[PDB]
Amino acid sequence: EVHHQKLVFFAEDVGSNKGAIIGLMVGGVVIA
Amino acid sequence: EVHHQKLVFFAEDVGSNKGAIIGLMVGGVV
Amino acid sequence: EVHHQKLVFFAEDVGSNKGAIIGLMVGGVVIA
Amino acid sequence: EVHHQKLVFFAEDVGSNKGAIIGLMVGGVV
Amino acid sequence: EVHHQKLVFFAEDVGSNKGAIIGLMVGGVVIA
Amino acid sequence: EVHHQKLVFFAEDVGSNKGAIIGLMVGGVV
Amino acid sequence: EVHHQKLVFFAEDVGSNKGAIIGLMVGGVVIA
Amino acid sequence: EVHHQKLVFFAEDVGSNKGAIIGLMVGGVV
Amino acid sequence: EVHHQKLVFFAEDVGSNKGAIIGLMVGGVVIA
Amino acid sequence: EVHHQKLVFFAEDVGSNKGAIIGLMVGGVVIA
Amino acid sequence: EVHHQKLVFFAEDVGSNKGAIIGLMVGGVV
Amino acid sequence: EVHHQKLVFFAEDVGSNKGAIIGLMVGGVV
Amino acid sequence: EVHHQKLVFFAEDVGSNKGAIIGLMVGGVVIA
Amino acid sequence: EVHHQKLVFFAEDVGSNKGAIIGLMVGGVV
Amino acid sequence: EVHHQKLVFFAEDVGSNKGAIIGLMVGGVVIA
Amino acid sequence: EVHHQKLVFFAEDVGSNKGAIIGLMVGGVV
């Protein structure tokens, strides 16, 4: 089947927003 | 044959926003 | 066959907007 | 066989604007 | 087949506008 | 086979417009 | 086959006009 | 078909006049 | 602090002159 | 502190020149 | 100091003359 | 504290040239 | 503190050059 | 305090070169 | 100590060069 | 603090020059 990628991230604030470190490293290898 | 690549981030501030570290690294070889 | 890449980022600040560090690096390699 | 590339960013303010750091660097080598 | 790229950025300044940093660097190469 | 390239920015001001720093550098070589 | 490039920039100034930094440097070359 | 290149900038005028810094350096050669 | 950009392109034609496709689209903007 | 970028590409055509595809898309952004 | 921008193209001429395609669209504005 | 970025590619021919596909897309968001 | 990034690719063809598919995608994200 | 990022590829042809798939995806967040 | 990264790949031919699929996916995450 | 940006391409011809397809699109926004 064809590649289906879904990445959902939620980051809500209710007083003092800061922000954390979020790193998404996606790697794919294949022939042709 | 559809390649559905959906990347969504939901950020909502209520008091005072600062700044998050969002790093999206997508690498593909064919 | 049909590439559908969609990146949607929501940044709704109701208090004081600052500035987040977002880096979108997508790399594709394919033999023509 | 269409290449649908949609990049949408929603930046809303209701108090004070500053300056976010968003970098979109995509590389496609065919 | 056919490339359809759509970049949409929303900036709703309601308080006191300033200025954000947005870099759009799309690199595409193909052998003709 | 129309290469649809739409680049749209919506900057609104109802307080005190200033100056956003946006750089659009699309590079394509066939 | 045919390039349909459209750049639309909306800048409101209901509060007070100023001056945004908008750099439009798109480069497209094809072998002849 | 014909190359449909459209560059449009819409600036409002309600507050104190000033001037935006736009650099339209689009390069397209075959 | 000071931009020192230099583009040097060497193209020899000892066999037969033709026509290379060189696209120079550098964009540099700074907030004022 | 200070950026020093140097891109050097060597193309020594001795047989029969044609044309290669080389895309240099450097994207750099920074809050001032 | 002063902005040192240098653009030099050195094309030789030994065989049959023709003509290269150079698109110099450098955009720099503050 | 210098940021040294050196990118060098050596393409040598002694028979017949064609056309390689090299794409260098780097993104630095500070 | 001092970044030293060097990418050196060697491609010496003594027979018949064709065309390899090389994609260099480096992404860096850091809070200013 | 030096970040030595050295990436080297040695491709040598003797008869007839074709085209290898070289994909380097380096992503780092801090 | 400071990050020292060294990647060396050899690909030599002696008759009929082809080329294999080599994908290097490096990912690093850290705070500030 | 001089921003050294050196872009140099060495294209030689001793057989029969044609046309390389090179696209240099550097985007920098401060």
Side-chain angles (χ1 to χ4, degrees):
Chain A
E1 239 53 88
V2 256
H3 189 82
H4 297 294
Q5 192 146 211
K6 175 176 173 281
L7 262 73
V8 189
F9 282 90
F10 290 94
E12 70 280 86
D13 166 61
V14 207
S16 306
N17 206 333
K18 183 206 185 71
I21 172 261
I22 316 169
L24 288 316
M25 285 78 62
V26 191
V29 281
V30 73
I31 53 172
Chain B
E1 302 297 275
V2 291
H3 189 123
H4 277 354
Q5 202 132 274
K6 187 240 295 294
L7 308 166
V8 288
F9 272 69
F10 290 78
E12 35 199 290
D13 157 68
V14 166
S16 295
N17 204 330
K18 188 268 183 84
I21 313 176
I22 305 174
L24 267 65
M25 320 294 176
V26 186
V29 300
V30 46
Chain C
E1 231 73 274
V2 212
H3 193 76
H4 295 278
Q5 201 165 214
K6 53 168 297 181
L7 279 79
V8 189
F9 285 66
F10 292 88
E12 36 182 89
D13 304 336
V14 304
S16 313
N17 308 50
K18 210 289 262 153
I21 184 75
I22 312 171
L24 299 320
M25 257 66 59
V26 182
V29 178
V30 57
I31 317 176
Chain D
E1 297 81 85
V2 301
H3 192 120
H4 270 350
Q5 179 184 328
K6 195 167 76 178
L7 306 170
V8 193
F9 282 69
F10 296 85
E12 305 173 20
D13 152 73
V14 212
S16 26
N17 309 259
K18 196 154 177 171
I21 343 171
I22 314 170
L24 290 87
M25 298 86 181
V26 291
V29 63
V30 188
Chain E
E1 279 220 318
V2 54
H3 199 159
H4 296 294
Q5 51 184 331
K6 193 172 70 185
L7 279 74
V8 192
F9 284 76
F10 294 95
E12 308 177 2
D13 299 42
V14 172
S16 305
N17 318 39
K18 197 196 137 297
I21 272 284
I22 302 174
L24 292 319
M25 292 87 193
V26 181
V29 308
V30 59
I31 290 288
Chain F
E1 280 61 72
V2 287
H3 206 142
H4 265 207
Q5 188 176 331
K6 182 187 178 183
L7 306 173
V8 61
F9 279 67
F10 296 96
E12 295 182 45
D13 161 53
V14 278
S16 34
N17 193 21
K18 205 177 191 179
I21 341 171
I22 48 175
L24 288 83
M25 295 89 187
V26 183
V29 53
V30 186
Chain G
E1 193 199 81
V2 189
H3 219 112
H4 281 244
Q5 181 177 208
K6 50 190 298 172
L7 280 78
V8 194
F9 289 81
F10 286 96
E12 298 202 319
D13 294 89
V14 180
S16 51
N17 303 77
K18 202 81 155 193
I21 292 289
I22 312 173
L24 302 320
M25 293 86 196
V26 184
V29 298
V30 184
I31 182 70
Chain H
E1 308 312 83
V2 194
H3 185 119
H4 270 48
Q5 187 72 28
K6 190 187 190 180
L7 304 161
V8 276
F9 287 78
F10 306 106
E12 254 306 313
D13 190 311
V14 184
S16 327
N17 281 142
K18 211 65 174 181
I21 308 298
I22 50 173
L24 285 77
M25 281 85 180
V26 186
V29 65
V30 182
Chain I
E1 195 191 298
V2 192
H3 221 115
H4 276 53
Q5 175 177 208
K6 51 182 301 177
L7 280 78
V8 194
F9 289 81
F10 287 92
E12 305 195 319
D13 293 88
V14 181
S16 64
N17 304 71
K18 211 97 164 194
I21 291 286
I22 313 175
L24 302 320
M25 294 88 193
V26 183
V29 299
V30 185
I31 181 69
Chain J
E1 185 169 75
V2 62
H3 192 216
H4 287 258
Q5 50 183 329
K6 188 172 73 178
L7 280 74
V8 193
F9 283 75
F10 294 92
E12 304 179 28
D13 301 44
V14 175
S16 299
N17 321 39
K18 187 192 141 305
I21 275 285
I22 300 172
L24 292 320
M25 291 87 194
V26 182
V29 308
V30 59
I31 296 284
Chain K
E1 317 307 83
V2 193
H3 184 128
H4 281 188
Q5 188 99 333
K6 183 183 180 174
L7 304 164
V8 275
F9 287 77
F10 305 108
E12 254 315 313
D13 177 17
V14 183
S16 36
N17 292 92
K18 200 72 183 186
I21 306 298
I22 47 175
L24 285 80
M25 286 90 178
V26 186
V29 68
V30 181
Chain L
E1 293 78 61
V2 299
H3 195 131
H4 271 18
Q5 180 175 326
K6 178 178 162 169
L7 305 171
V8 186
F9 282 67
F10 300 88
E12 302 161 22
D13 150 75
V14 234
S16 32
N17 311 78
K18 206 160 199 271
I21 344 171
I22 313 171
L24 289 86
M25 297 87 181
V26 290
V29 62
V30 187
Chain M
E1 212 68 79
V2 198
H3 195 73
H4 284 271
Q5 197 157 215
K6 54 183 292 197
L7 279 79
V8 190
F9 284 66
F10 293 88
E12 39 176 285
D13 304 342
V14 299
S16 356
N17 309 59
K18 213 283 274 169
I21 183 77
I22 312 172
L24 300 319
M25 256 66 61
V26 182
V29 177
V30 57
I31 326 173
Chain N
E1 294 291 283
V2 287
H3 191 124
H4 279 189
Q5 197 95 325
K6 204 259 291 302
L7 309 166
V8 286
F9 273 67
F10 293 76
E12 307 179 70
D13 162 67
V14 162
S16 308
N17 203 333
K18 182 191 174 63
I21 316 174
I22 304 173
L24 268 65
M25 320 293 175
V26 186
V29 301
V30 46
Chain O
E1 227 65 277
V2 261
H3 189 78
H4 293 301
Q5 196 153 211
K6 170 178 164 285
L7 268 77
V8 192
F9 282 80
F10 294 98
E12 343 132 87
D13 168 59
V14 233
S16 324
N17 209 330
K18 180 222 191 76
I21 170 258
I22 316 171
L24 289 318
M25 281 77 59
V26 185
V29 281
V30 74
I31 59 168
Chain P
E1 270 48 75
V2 296
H3 203 137
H4 265 232
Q5 188 174 332
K6 179 183 170 180
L7 307 172
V8 60
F9 279 66
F10 296 95
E12 314 200 330
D13 161 52
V14 285
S16 49
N17 191 22
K18 192 166 165 146
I21 342 171
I22 48 176
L24 287 82
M25 296 89 187
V26 182
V29 53
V30 187

